[PDB]
Design a protein. Structure first.
Lengths: 49, 49
């Protein structure tokens, strides 16, 4: 990229790298609670929500 | 001893409605046995419960 930028005036290439720390978490324990309901019917099939 | 007609004031009534997805069927029936309606409808449609 630096060799390209040295040989060209009206066009420039660029390069960059950034790191990532995305923390995951809500403010409280109550904000993270979840629930579900699962049924098993007599033919063996399952309904989940 | 002779028989007897139930003579429920509401006659046999039902409205069956396909969802349009995965052959889902919502069946609204005047019945005493929703689980039985589920079995015979799914069996006739070759579907899981």
């Amino acid at each position: 990229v630096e060799k390209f930028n040295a040989e060209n005036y009206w066009k420039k290439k660029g390069l960059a790298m950034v790191p990532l720390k995305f923390p995951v978490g809500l403010g409280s324990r109550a904000a993270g609670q979840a629930a579900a309901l699962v049924h098993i019917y007599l033919d063996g099939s399952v309904l989940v929500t | 001893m002779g028989g007897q007609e139930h003579f429920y004031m509401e006659t046999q009534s039902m409205l069956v409605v396909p969802k349009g997805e995965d052959q889902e069927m919502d069946v609204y029936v005047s019945t005493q046995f929703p689980k039985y309606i589920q079995d015979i409808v799914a069996s006739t449609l070759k579907l899981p419960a």
